Design a protein around this ligand. Structure first.
Ligand code: ATP
Ligand code: ATP
Ligand code: ATP
Ligand code: ATP
Ligand code: MG
Ligand code: MG
Ligand code: MG
Ligand code: MG
Lengths: 743, 680
């Protein structure tokens, strides 16, 4: 119930926005029982409160067809109130609305292009002649007249912001034409409703910022001071500065914006004075909100700062934050991608004391974000955004916006066959037939990738489970560990049993350890991170473990995720394996991997997979419970599995019907999966050699091979060798025997 | 569908540029049926649109010999329209072209060298007398008369930009003469047609940079904002800066350049101030393009950056791209060859959201690059660019340009002994005779090596397959090893199986393991990286693995490449044999080689070949198929080989007829090939 502040509550003034029947730009209608409930009289002026602090004046009337909870209200004041159909607005009477003296209204530039008539007599005089229409400073109204309808913007009113347009009120239209860009930017201004997937964080921010500034007495009587510093921290793209934009657009208090690097100045000491002057500018316009974007830019650790001016700036900020209690009416926010780099003194109680964590949205959060970004988008009927939000597993809101933009560009590509770039104009019918479909979202989802992982992505060959032969039980387990919590989250969480956070693959080389990982990457609907072992190591001190920390943190945001540590022999070898280990850089890397895997334990599933080649050198601390709990032995295929391996490799290759894949398996008593592949590649190469010789033979006399035959496999069989010998197999069993005895 | 934007849809306005017959500078010729198709009347003034947003005005005159798909025009308008014979331009009516009031023309300096008379009366007044010539600002036209034909530049007109030179129109030529260098630079300006091998990338960049600018209504209708950030990445020489230059040249929007290190300044807060001033200037002149060249110079990782000024620069860039005050129709482009070094915050959407990879071109793309680079050059008829493109395997566009320059330099060299360095002038006959032959491409190609490989280059003693005696079967496996996947990639795909890309040579010393590698380096048509074993290893903790990674990454960039390990038992030994071996780095290097050879990445045409004296210490993982899958045993020569080895050594050696090499093979039984050479 921490979101009770978000709940819009029941107010009699609340009404639903609906299409108008006869309502013009200055009159609205309410139902007669609602008029009697609100004590609203016909002919009274009423005020409508919408989103983004947008307000308008209209006359209230009675309509017997109007629902009680609903209002009849036309589109001009819809755009004025910045609301759409279905929205909830507030209505109250406004007394003491006097006759207007002078108003300055100016047309919209694109609504008057090519128009040279007398604007007053054609447009303003007939519309306001003896109508007594109520207006507001900044109102937009559409007037019919001349050869094309014209919209105007009110620029000045006398008095302001409310007055009555009387027949003797001075109305003039001279002035510079208002550009469309300003009106469009004001219309597309961001509000709270733009924000999705962070309702809890939105409630926290509102009750930390808006409620104290709006009602300081409500806190005063109970005797608790408002929170003076709020820190918004999270991974890039989550919507921190979007929250800042929403607050700045829909708060009552004056808003001051500070960008960290902007504080810097060349003159000696002027940067601290700039921070100071910003704070006193907040002082004069109290109450106020200060937003310090990129706080880590100007607030590093003073223990680690090598510059005098930066250290002075941090200390000056600390002094200002300490005095912020003396201010009593100023609230400061800060957004940072790395909260850990900020000096801890700025995180002490009384300085950024309450920290809000803007996190990765869930499935319903991603659905909300997608719906928000598709509100201006035009969609067909086949589109279902719930599936799209389901398929985006680790995507942050910025990634979802990128997905929507890519899908729109894909629809534009689909229409690019008809549209011509070099054309001076675009046809109307082609423009109208343009629309976004499910196929565009599916293409975008194909090309979609979280921005956090673009540095860990690798191009993996196309591998599907049918490509892998044998290991049928192993395949089921891998789907039973990965696919069930991904597809059935409710089952696992309800039971409450602790999961295995690892599956170590130990087996002879070429038996499918890496292919199973490729199958996970291509099929399983979870973000995949492939870590080649010795990538994380760095010769420079401290960074080698840092790369381990960031990678483990990197998979943390994108849960569901699979962290594939290929060849654990390098990063995680036995403690004391380097008996000297004077530097300890390898040892500290092994310890760091231990810290992270034990460090995180929560509902969101992050699977760590290691495809070790020879598992005995691995530190057993990795294999001990709590880390890599489940182990799968990837064995050499038997006679039945080998036939599947031969079929899976040869399924895309045209082969003779005479070739018996069952016969080849029993001859290959001990061959691995890779060895069976070499038999097929060797046979394929021999067929190519014949085809090259055949085509040379035919062209030589003038101046082939449709499929691999039985003789081709016969010639390729003699070159075949058994890669992994019997002695190598025993050690792989020996590791299992030692673990089984301990188990 | 990806390159749908690059389709040049056929419209009647699209016409082929053709030579002139009797036309002067101010007219072009169209076929009568095509005129009736577009309702064009003879004598009408029309507006011509060409490359690089270049416009010209010409009069339409009918010709029965003019093709319906072609338009006749002279050299002057073609140089005005920045097009060539065989290009496509758009022709449309240009009404309301008024009579000129007063125009300013300035002659070209090199056409007036030695002319001291009144340029007006000598050239211009006869040129425009009762002609009503249509002219446009910036046009270049040549006038005959006097002592030498003189070109003129129209720098200003009244009205603008189109007017007709009427008899009363004032034509004055006073002013500062125009430099030749400026005209040359403008004529050799770089456009979208100068970039080859990047059709997908050009499609993406045109969709991002050109399409929203030219049609800012499609996105308004569909209700989205097109991506406003492009990050071009790839190995050096692929053309990222070239694509930036083409975009700057061919766009109408204001274009601002930001070189990386130019931002840095002495005084505190001047780097942030410079970035802010650039972005504010772009915002004022919206729509605009900002190009940040060498972005990794000023945008490194904040967590990996020591100096606080650099982190402040990164934060300022982050706030400028996306902050509380969003950008106003500004597109930001950047080019780096290390996209991973860029800070992770810059890569998300609302920033460098679209990352476009300028990869190494394949055969057809590099043929396109060669055609682009040879359009200005003059070549003999015997040349074949297709063969030159086929032979250049790992070359990048810069390397192809270097090949062209080297070939032209060889063409100059061939004509050197005729001409003199200290002579005042070159013989005109030598200049006319001068041309680039196929021999010059062949020589430049022989000396041509990729830029990526200018470090891993060694001198090889030029061994041929005939130098190696015996090993007849092994040679056939080696020749078809590298030839088949590159010469016939279709055959593998038709049979649908991956080629084998690994060979291990093991045998007694002196039997030709290193010799076979020498022959591969010369005879085989693929890049060759030869590295001895221990050279990769380094004192530092992570360097020894990073060295292995960059060699394999370098071989991938140069595919098809052969990566030969001279003593593979050095760098690839059995793990666990020595506990505490060094810092454990030797075992980790084996792991690095293991993942690079066969891992989760897609495998290119990189053939890994290794030779080892003692293969028993080789790590069994390295021997697994998919890594050195073929284990070739090169044993001591039999009697038949011992004859061949003796003959191969002495093939260039004058020997007596009486000595019988056949007997020598029978006496030696366990002799190695090195031992046989010792006798010789
Ligand atoms: N929860 C959300 N709901 C709706 N839109 C969102 C949400 N989160 C992000 N976006 C959108 O995705 C983009 C995120 O950019 P923005 O700069 O606001 O994110 P940020 O995480 O605060 O940034 P940074 O980490 O760089 O400070 C914007 O286009 C924003 O509108
Ligand atoms: N079950 C299988 N079905 C089909 N192909 C297989 C199978 N097992 C192995 N292969 C083949 O072997 C190769 C896969 O080797 P992989 O990298 O998975 O081996 P590994 O057991 O992880 O060994 P290592 O990492 O020690 O070399 C591919 O060429 C693949 O075609
Ligand atoms: N695709 C291409 N088409 C035509 N010419 C090309 C192409 N790529 C490179 N070139 C040629 O190579 C040079 C372009 O170098 P450029 O500065 O664009 O490379 P780059 O990839 O940006 O390099 P770096 O990353 O080192 O800055 C020019 O001489 C140009 O003619
Ligand atoms: N088959 C051969 N034909 C001709 N010369 C040969 C042959 N085998 C060896 N030689 C001669 O042996 C000498 C060096 O041989 P090479 O370097 O190829 O041996 P290797 O087997 O690779 O040795 P190592 O593994 O010990 O480095 C050269 O003089 C070369 O001419
Ligand atoms: Mg932000
Ligand atoms: Mg593997
Ligand atoms: Mg460059
Ligand atoms: Mg050797």
């Amino acid at each position: 119930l921490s979101t009770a502040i978000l709940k819009q509550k029941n107010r009699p003034n609340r009404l639903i926005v609906d299409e108008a029947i006869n309502e013009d730009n200055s009159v609205v209608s309410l139902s007669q029982p609602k008029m009697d409930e609100l004590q609203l009289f016909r002919g009274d002026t009423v005020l409508l409160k919408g989103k983004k602090r947008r307000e308008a004046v209209c006359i209230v009337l009675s309509d017997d067809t109007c629902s009680d909870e609903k209002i009849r209200m036309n589109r001009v004041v819809r755009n004025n109130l910045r609301v759409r159909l279905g929205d909830v607005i507030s209505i109250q009477p406004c007394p003491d609305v006097k006759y207007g003296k002078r108003i300055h209204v100016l047309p919209i530039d694109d609504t008057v292009e090519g128009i040279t008539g007398n604007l007053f007599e054609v447009y303003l005089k007939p519309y306001f002649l003896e109508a007594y229409r109520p207006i507001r400073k900044g109102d937009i109204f559409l007037v019919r007249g001349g050869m094309r309808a014209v919209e105007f913007k009110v620029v000045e009113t006398d008095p302001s912001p409310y007055c009555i347009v009387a027949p003797d009120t001075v109305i003039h239209c001279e002035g510079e034409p208002i550009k469309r860009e300003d009106e469009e930017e004001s219309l597309n201004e961001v509000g709270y409703d733009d924000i999705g997937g962070c309702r809890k964080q939105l409630a926290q921010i509102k009750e930390m910022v808006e409620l104290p500034l709006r009602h300081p007495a409500l806190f005063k009587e109970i005797g608790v001071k408002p929170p003076r510093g709020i820190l918004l921290y999270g991974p890039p793209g989550t919507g921190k500065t979007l929250i800042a934009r929403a607050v700045a657009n829909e708060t009552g208090a004056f808003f001051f914006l500070i960008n960290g690097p902007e504080i810097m100045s060349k003159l000696a000491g002027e940067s601290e004075s700039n921070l100071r002057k910003a704070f006193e500018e907040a002082e004069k316009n109290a109450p106020a909100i200060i937003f310090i974007d990129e706080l880590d830019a100007i607030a590093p650790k003073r223990e680690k700062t090598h510059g005098e001016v930066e250290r002075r700036i941090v200390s000056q900020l600390l002094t200002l934050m300490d005095g912020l209690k003396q201010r009593a009416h100023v609230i400061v926010m800060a957004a940072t991608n790395r909260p850990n780099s900020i000096d801890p003194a700025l995180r002490r109680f009384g300085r950024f004391d309450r920290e809000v964590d803007i996190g990765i949205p869930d499935a319903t959060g991603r659905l909300e974000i997608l719906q928000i970004h598709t509100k201006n988008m035009k969609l067909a009927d086949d589109v279902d955004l719930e599936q799209v939000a389901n398929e985006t597993h680790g995507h942050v809101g910025a990634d979802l916006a990128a997905l929507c933009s890519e899908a729109a560009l894909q629809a534009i590509r689909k229409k690019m066959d008809l549209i011509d770039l070099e054309d001076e104009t675009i046809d109307a019918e082609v423009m109208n037939s343009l629309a976004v479909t499910m196929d565009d979202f599916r293409w975008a989802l194909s090309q979609s990738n979280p921005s956090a992982l673009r540095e860990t992505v690798v191009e993996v060959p196309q591998v599907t489970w049918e490509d892998i032969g044998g290991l049928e039980d192993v395949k089921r387990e891998l789907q039973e560990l990965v696919q069930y919590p991904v597809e059935h989250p409710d089952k696992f969480l309800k039971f409450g049993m602790t999961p295995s956070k690892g599956v170590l693959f130990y087996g002879p080389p070429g038996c499918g350890k890496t292919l199973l990982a490729k199958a996970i990457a291509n099929e399983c609907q979870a973000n995949f991170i492939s870590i080649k072992g010795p990538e994380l190591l760095t010769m420079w001190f401290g960074e080698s473990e840092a790369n381990v920390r960031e990678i483990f943190d990197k998979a943390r945001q994108a849960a569901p995720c699979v962290l594939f540590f290929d060849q654990l022999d390098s990063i995680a070898k036995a403690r004391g394996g380097n008996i000297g280990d004077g530097g300890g850089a390898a040892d500290r890397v092994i310890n760091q991997i231990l810290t992270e895997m034990d460090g995180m334990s929560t509902k969101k599933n992050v699977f760590i997979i290691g495809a070790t080649n020879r598992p005995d050198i691995i530190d057993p601390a990795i294999l001990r419970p709590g880390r890599l709990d489940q182990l799968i032995y990837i064995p050499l295929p038997d006679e039945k599995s080998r036939v599947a391996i031969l079929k899976a490799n040869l399924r895309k290759s045209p082969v003779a019907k005479d070739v018996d894949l069952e016969f080849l398996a029993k001859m290959t008593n001990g061959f691995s999966g890779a060895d069976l592949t070499e038999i097929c590649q060797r046979a394929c190469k021999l067929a190519i050699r014949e085809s090259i010789e055949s085509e040379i033979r035919r062209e030589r006399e003038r101046q082939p091979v449709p499929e691999i035959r039985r003789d081709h496999f016969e010639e390729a069989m003699r070159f075949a060798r058994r890669s992994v010998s019997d002695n190598d197999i025993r050690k792989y069993e020996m590791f299992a025997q030692t673990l089984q005895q301990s188990r």
